[PDB]
Amino acid sequence: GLQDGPEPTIHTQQAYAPEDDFTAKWTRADARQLQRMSDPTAPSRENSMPASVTMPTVPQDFPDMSNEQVWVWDTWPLTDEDANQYSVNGWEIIFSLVADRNLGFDDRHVFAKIGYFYRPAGVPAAERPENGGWTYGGLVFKEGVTGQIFEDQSFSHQTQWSGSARVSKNGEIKLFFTDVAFYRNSDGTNIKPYDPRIALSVGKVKANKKGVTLTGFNKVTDLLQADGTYYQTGAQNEFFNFRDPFTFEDPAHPGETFMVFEGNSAMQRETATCNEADLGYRQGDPYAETVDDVNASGATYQIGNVGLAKAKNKQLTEWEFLPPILSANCVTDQTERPQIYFKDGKSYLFTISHRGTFAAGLDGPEGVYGFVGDGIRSDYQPLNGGSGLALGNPTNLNFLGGQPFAPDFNQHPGHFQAYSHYVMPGGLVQSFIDTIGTHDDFVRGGTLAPTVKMDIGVGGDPTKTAVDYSYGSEGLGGWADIPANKHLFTNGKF
Ligand SMILES: OC[C@H]1O[C@](O)(CO)[C@@H](O)[C@@H]1O
């Protein structure tokens, strides 16, 4: 099922110490496996990617989870150190990026705020309302709280971007998020590079038959900002990426807490260079590229990475940067919302990427990219023939991808059907709808897609994944289905 092309880079999956300076590479040889898996003959508007690594097609006639109260995108459940998802006092609880529904959908990122939703626990997806049955609890933060941490109070915009939320046995919520200040002119041009920081706010859940409210979240702790040695700063790159904290405990490292997040490789933007390891070709491969050609191609502007940090105290208020665990130099600018998923003694690193963010020479669908190894720092093996693709939107890779605000004439109408995928226990994947439809008949989402099922480690092979098309209806589960697998009871009432 593979078009002729380069062999994938040999990865060993060998574990290293979390403190080691080893950084796994998702190589150009690896990423070129995506084109090899693509069917070059796929007709207009048909998916060219294998069905087993393609998200089931989402109906253009979709429900809205908030009844159009707000735009909703990146969503996370309430988790413990093993990423189990929780209900509290009979309520499933989630956090989402939200914005005023009056905004143009594409203008919402600089008005982003974290809200929460709740719904009764223990109702099967088929018994719930079509739209998932969530209640919008409103915003997590009072106005002016998240601005606390910024010395420069001259920002034109101040937002809360994605993260994660930990719940203790005693009902305490530690919300890890991206706290962002923007310094923009009225047309959007920067006055100085934006300021995204990894941050923490602590609060409490109050829940009974009336619903869920939150208390606390009045103080914000500034945990991490880009350093310039491991993770690219604003001075190195005006549009550097630094966001999306996911915390966890590594079974291999008892009694410590780690965090993954999105960054870029710490290189000056306009003088960034790639090397032989970034290309990752086997000696003599007839399809190998030269370092000079790649460096001349423009691919050097795509230098995303996945970072690691280790907590310095039990309160998780102090963190230490560790070297990056994955770099995609000359492959992609954006490895977003990383998470570490633990299965059968392996460490799965899952991350999301756009189609447009791939480097020159490369191409792949919007969706979930994944990597397996024997430790949180390992010589990670990109999933599915070394390509990295776990779960892509249906995509004809033979035609231009277009944009979510202007779909391409020849593209599959589900090209942008989902983003910010998150892999839940049992391989259930939740995501939000960006765009569904053809070039002249499309709609914007800003609500969650149907939850789907990805089987991880198909056959006896931990490097392989496959969509389960028998799940729900033809592969599509409940709209906005973010089910709890653990249940907590606490003092919090209101
Ligand atoms: O968790 C602390 C332990 O982990 C290490 O730092 C290695 O990753 C060891 O040197 C130490 O015993």
Ligand SMILES: OC[C@H]1O[C@](O)(CO)[C@@H](O)[C@@H]1O
């Ligand atoms: O809106 C910004 C947020 O959206 C994403 O780009 C994905 O949709 C995240 O990486 C980020 O936290």
Ligand SMILES: OC[C@H]1O[C@](O)(CO)[C@@H](O)[C@@H]1O
């Ligand atoms: O604890 C069980 C009770 O909690 C709820 O899920 C929410 O209040 C109710 O639907 C149920 O009667």
Ligand SMILES: OC[C@H]1O[C@](O)(CO)[C@@H](O)[C@@H]1O
């Ligand atoms: O809501 C309409 C349809 O959407 C699904 O969740 C999957 O697309 C089905 O279960 C339902 O029939």
